[PDB]
């Protein structure tokens, strides 16, 4: 039995759409049939084959890691998982000995009709959640950990960056009672998506003064919460200036390099609480994500800008991403 897969055949740009054997689940593994799979920034780096990918990816290897699938076969030893289960996957494979590898980065991914998954990284989904939303749970998890690092209901918020993560952040913040949610994004396309998801105010940082606008919106008090989703040094500076004294900051975005910041006046004298964010990858975050999805309060439709039937148009998909003309791209099978 053969299957179609988007694979990084060798070092270099792009990828190849090929047909390989349907993998067989070994001890502690299960086989899932892919229903939907979405593309992430990490996948784009592997595609473009940058410095990062050039040092960690070992081709040939199937790409992708975000998925919504159905278990079709369970390997030896597996317990608690049955054929027919609707599932998604946690990408971080931890060892549990730390004081490890990433699914779809150090192993074959889910951009194929079927995929092998370690049983321990399986998350069961309620049948009511559509595949196109279920596949966004890993990214949603990062957004949830960023937004909910502290209290947010009835709090004013400044979100810098409206890429897919920032958009998911807006959706989580609004569903969590945040108001007003202010979003700064230079891209016209993404700034408009932010508005559609639910941003109460949007700011174009290349045409307006972010801090001034925030001060106007918050009557000079600043925002209670600043969430950094862009990775732009300037945005970090602006948010630290815009956050109210004793406010909370969550940093998810990754910068080009080191950043030069006025710690004395913006962090120390303002007595801020700053949380560095990276994926929890523990079930607690997944429980929160699942419930928010089941609640119907997450306005995700505007975020899914592209839905492809099959993997055939993969090249077009990756190109649209590089051109910054996408929110979230999903492959439907």
């Amino acid at each position: 039995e053969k299957m179609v897969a988007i694979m990084k055949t060798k070092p270099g740009y792009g990828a190849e759409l090929v047909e390989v054997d349907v993998p067989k689940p070994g001890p502690g593994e299960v086989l899932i049939k892919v229903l939907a799979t979405s593309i992430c920034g990490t996948d784009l780096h592997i595609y473009e084959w940058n410095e990062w990918a050039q040092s960690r990816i070992k081709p040939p290897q199937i790409m992708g890691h975000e998925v919504a699938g159905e278990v079709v076969e369970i390997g030896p030893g597996v317990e608690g998982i049955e054929v027919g289960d609707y599932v998604s996957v946690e990408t971080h494979i931890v060892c549990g000995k730390c004081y490890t590898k990433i699914f779809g980065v150090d192993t074959d991914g889910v951009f194929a009709e079927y995929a092998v998954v370690p049983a321990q990284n399986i998350w069961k989904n309620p049948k009511s959640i559509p595949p196109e939303y279920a596949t966004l749970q890993e990214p949603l998890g990062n957004a949830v950990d960023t937004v909910l690092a502290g209290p947010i209901s009835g709090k004013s918020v400044l979100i810098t960056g409206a890429g897919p993560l920032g958009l998911l952040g807006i959706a989580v913040a609004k569903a969590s009672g945040a108001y007003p949610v202010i979003v700064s994004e230079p891209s016209d396309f993404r700034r408009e998506l932010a508005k559609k998801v639910g941003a109460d105010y949007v700011i174009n940082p290349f045409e307006e003064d972010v801090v001034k606008e925030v001060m106007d919106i918050t009557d000079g008090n600043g925002v209670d919460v600043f969430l950094e989703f862009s990775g732009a040094p300037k945005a970090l500076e602006q948010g630290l200036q815009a956050v109210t004294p004793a406010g909370r900051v969550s940093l998810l975005g990754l910068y080009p390099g080191k950043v030069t910041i006025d710690f004395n006046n913006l962090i120390i004298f303002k007595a801020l609480t700053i949380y560095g964010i990276t994926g929890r990858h523990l079930w607690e975050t997944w429980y929160t994500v699942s419930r928010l999805l089941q609640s119907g309060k997450l306005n995700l439709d505007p975020i899914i800008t592209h839905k492809y039937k099959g993997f055939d148009k993969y090249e077009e998909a990756f190109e649209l991403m590089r051109a910054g003309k996408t929110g979230k791209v999903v492959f439907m099978l």
Copy 2:
């Protein structure tokens, strides 16, 4: 200049609708013109004149404490407040020396066309918030402190009691991303109001087994959060049984007397976190309430079951309350 007022003229049942002089604001006080004022359980006790009222109320005295008004005159010394300001009032008058008196309980209230208010208890409202909603801010504050005593977004919740406070609790929980929100209320009328506000599931405790139903809804895990809004001993027992181990409980409801509870198995062995709730009455809670109101996410319309024009039908209003046929009653001026 005279004004109409609902006043507790003397000890006994009921109250009198009279006309008295429009009060004049003294040092540290301001005069507000009432736009809307709502009735609370405390007001009903003063009306019925029970043991509690019989020991603290000193008639004659104007009733009521929940209000939305406009400042028409500022007394001597007052700073930061100007004529024309749209405001609401914090009822607890604290001393700031503790490690005191209640507005509308130990002083004249707001069930009149005008009312004198200590400047320090004034809260300025954004002009966008309608009077009928602004007057519910004190009760909303109790609901916010109960619901938001801990994390709630993407958490399952059991609310026992759907009286006005429980209804406001449901509205706050839903706006805060809680799901599913399960409400137990024996009253058919109020149980239906709960559904209209936004309860995901409702339970009639006199016809169903609360714990069983919760277990069914949560697949045997129990709820992450239990909020007690009824004051019924049985409900407290049920919630403690229904809450997941290591879950959180917020207790607002007041019981008839002491309660007998299995601490060993329900609290200690389940490692619960229990918060006793009573009104914050500090600005932080008011900031949260104001933002949630401005967000438009609080489904308050179903809670306001009665809107009276003027105070003339006050007797009918209080009677409907005793008959348990109301959510929140508001007087519009």
Copy 3:
């Protein structure tokens, strides 16, 4: 090769000192040579063979669970543990699937010269910690989770109950900067031990009014923290009355049955934070315990009232415990 062991041979009172084969470690297990082992309340119940033991203990079975030992042999599969390692044991054997069995309760214990231990429940000890202190880590863990459930440095504290757990609680609280630490204990012997460990004030509840004394010590403010280590209904009532409004309570002690408490005035109106405590049994607590032991700040010497060489005098040990004439009893090998 044979070894001496204190074993519950059959249903009934007492136990037998016998000689059995030195167990052999199977897959995922290791064999430790016991250096020191201490007696706990649970062991006494198994000895006395009460209702609880009569329903869970399946004789014949080696008693005891608190230990400090040295690994002498590692079973198949075991990684991270080498022969010669100085270790202690976590008693709760969890499954990791919950939203299980207890070492020394549902399995052979450590009251023997050698004992088999699941590798996953092994905790490595720094060689600087003496065996007689290392064996008290499980009980210390319960005390740490109770005392440190919230902030405690520079906080006033009321501890009810000075049994071994309460004594360990006093030691942890003092090492953590608590002051003053007030201890209520009716037993003259244990009340004196409390003073020796480091209690700043002691109260004899059968001769004095606990709440009055606390109020005198705290100038009418009450204590910031109330830790219940007795399991006595009256003590729970007194602590809830003695704790300052908005204070914190940690409940570890287990009551005879249900308790009748004034929730309205003592918990709700005082806006308390109540934590039900039961053993963490996760590494975080063990890390805290280990560091506190290494710090030399825990005054444990007064708590170890009896040190026996070998198991021969086991009957005398258990009897002294029932007579309430002990703090902590340790068997040295």
Copy 4:
């Protein structure tokens, strides 16, 4: 009646020891007789008259702000304070309207035999606390807010900087159960003081590799808590590298200017919690400080390196400070 005072007579270096009228307390003020007063970094800047002082100090003005005194006269309106009360002073005079001025910076200080103090900034001291320790409460408050920003008992700690604040930090951390407490300080004199206060390990950053040493002490895990008390850019970098992933950081030290930091790897990928610290100046911190002082657990003797009788040798005192040959200097009256 005249009194001696250390006063900044005019712009420029140094100060003058003069005799002026004993001030009289006006409305809301009280007069205290100084028993002990200590010198702070702020006082040294006013003495040296740097850019900061050159822009905020308005001479003539009495210097100093840290004090332990006795109330000798109460002004009009004052309540709750009686002649004979042993007190200390909170330096931050807040307005309570914020979403202001500093005692001893924008007003006459306490380096005189008597001083006028706003009643609201008075803190009553237990008579058991010696004047030389009571006068260190404001600085201790900064140290407490830094150390206790999060949990610390049984946690490993790295403190960078052993100036007076860092020394007080070490004393608070040890009294709070921290272990091991690692201190990095280039000054031989201060590094030795750190050891005397109670540091478990000391590091000379100009002769050793701080991170390497921390890794050796913590077996490659890093410290649970990093407290920055130096204000040195390099120290901030080292602590962020030395703190364990998901650890906590408290920043009190103020840097020369902006700092360039690797946010991606040290804060974001390590999921740190960072607290910017500046003085609480609210009673809660004062309550904690007072109890820790009453506990006798703070090893403050080594920190007080100089005790002067009277103000006569003020010039010598300030010079010793600039030469970095002091811990804390106290004037005894």
